[PDB]
Subunit: 131 residues, 3 copies
């Protein structure tokens, strides 16, 4: 999967990387992807640039929001996706990211929609095994 | 929906926030989403980092391009999406964004592809109503 | 299509642009999209904020990775995508982007998911031909 993590520049570089590490540990545990199937883009913002409310659920967030956008191939069940959300949030709690400040979205594609390098689609050639 | 708004640094911090306000308000009007269903990431770029032309439609854009990438649940009709494009662009005009400088894209997913926080999939649990 | 190109800040302004040009030229050569159907957002990061390993394929990348995320409408064949992945990488090679350092992902939507400006959905109105 390719993960876009948009968070706030108020967080230290150390913590930003820990957040990234946390997200990856979680996906590996839940999804059983290769340990090295790690592809993440960390974009830090002034908190004013991230606006994330509650869709009327009834809770507030701090300014230190963390938005995690997961681009992964289709196939995963609803419960597996629920597991991902729970796993990521839990792994982020101890490293200073509150549950209220996590927002997660999934966007799917297919195996043939990926090139890991060298201009090759490794799922299509079979060099890389599909989950 | 999660809205990625990429625009340029020549626009005032004030104007951006206003741009963001107008896009949200447009979506509440056309999509009838909860008023607090606001999830936006603002990335201001050096204009050289955004290259948006006209696909041969025969018009020019200022360097101050504004690209709106809407990530929303599948199900909206073709006509509703047209209403969204038009409402957004009409709301941006008075704010200082010419019609030529707007570009909008929609990318879809499922209700079970969202966690609004706390590690839960609110659309799945029933904590949050589905469109 | 809309392309998110995420690369590292150490690359020069001229190189960033040639990288963007190389990617566009590739899509034109392979997808036969219009020459001016060009929509690219570039984001430069400290290399620490782009994390791309090998998914266990058994190779290493330099810090100067380039992630290219193609948002385009569905319809292209697997083989055509293979050819796209190839073209992009081959075009980027002499620009100083090694094959090891390119990561490509594709995300699809529909013709009615596009506004090229002026509050209009151009594929829907016939103003622009479905490619």
């Amino acid at each position: 999967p390719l993960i876009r993590i948009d968070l706030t520049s108020d967080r230290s570089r150390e913590q930003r990387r820990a957040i990234a590490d946390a997200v990856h540990d979680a996906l590996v545990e839940v999804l059983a992807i290769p340990a090295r199937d790690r592809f993440q883009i960390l974009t830090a913002h002034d908190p004013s640039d991230i606006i994330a409310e509650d869709a009327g659920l009834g809770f507030q967030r701090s300014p230190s929001v963390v938005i995690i956008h997961v681009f992964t191939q289709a196939g995963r069940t609803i419960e597996t996706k629920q597991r991902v959300f729970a796993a990521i949030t839990e792994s982020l709690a101890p490293i200073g990211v509150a549950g209220s400040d996590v927002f997660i979205a999934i966007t799917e594609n297919a195996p043939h929609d990926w090139s890991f390098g060298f201009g090759s689609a490794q799922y299509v050639t079979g060099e890389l095994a599909i989950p």
